[PDB]
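User: quick one - fold this with calcium ion bound?
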Amino acid sequence: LEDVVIDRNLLILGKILGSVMEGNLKQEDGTSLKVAVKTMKLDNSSQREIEEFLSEAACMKDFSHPNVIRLLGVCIEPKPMVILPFMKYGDLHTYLLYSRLETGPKHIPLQTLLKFMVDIALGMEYLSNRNFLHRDLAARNCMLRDDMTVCVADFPVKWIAIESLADRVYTSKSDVWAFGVTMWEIATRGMTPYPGVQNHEMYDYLLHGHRLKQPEDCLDELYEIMYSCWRTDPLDRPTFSVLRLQLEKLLESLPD
Ligand SMILES: CCCCNc1ncc2c(-c3ccc(F)cc3)nn(C[C@H]3CC[C@H](N)CC3)c2n1
Ligand SMILES: [Ca+2]
Ligand SMILES: [Ca+2]
Ligand SMILES: [Cl-]
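Assistant: Sure. Structure tokens for the protein plus calcium ion:
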């Protein structure tokens, strides 16, 4: 059960980054790794929030994919602390904004944009196969690896699917809805979803059939892919494995 638990003494906490802090983890191999330490705002006076925490934690430590963040361990003071690899390049959201500045990253071609999307599709395929729900999929939660590949992490009304807003239901298809909204952030290079539309308007807005509008120089085929993610009936939406292959093929059809 409690194999993932790491001794507090092996950990050094630094300045607050986003509460998520910077840290130095000392490993079994002698060396030290740079980490990020999310402290959970968790409910005590009831062991129910803490039991579900560890249960997911243990399941998360066994996750080993190049497009999914690695849960390096769990520490406890009685505050629970997830330990994660530190990514010097940061979240994909900020990167995208930065890209539209001189002195910041280069102008991103569509090939790299699709490639970001593909990477999230691969991470979400892996999780959907393990029956693990993300629950908070958005571009700001995708981290960039040192080799500039994207992993999903941190597992906001404008990302929630209609059924999840209306009812209390959330499945893999709700995650698929979020993925399209994420797809759209990448194609817009960091726009906020539903410009002009406010948070309390969302439910009635989506209930009338309106969805995220097509970005200007965005391919017809890519909007077709992201739109399939917002079909009213969850069972009408493609799985992450379907989506992964459509993006991989679409990207392959674009020149090198
Ligand atoms: C919580 C899962 C992610 C764990 N790894 C990780 N790695 C790096 C960072 C940096 C960061 C800060 C300044 C820089 F120049 C470069 C990077 N901030 N955060 C915390 C953010 C990550 C994005 C999220 N949306 C809010 C919390 C980082 N987390
Ligand atoms: Ca057209
Ligand atoms: Ca139907
Ligand atoms: Cl829109």
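One thing worth noting: Residues 220 surround calcium ion (ligand 2) (CB under 6 Å).
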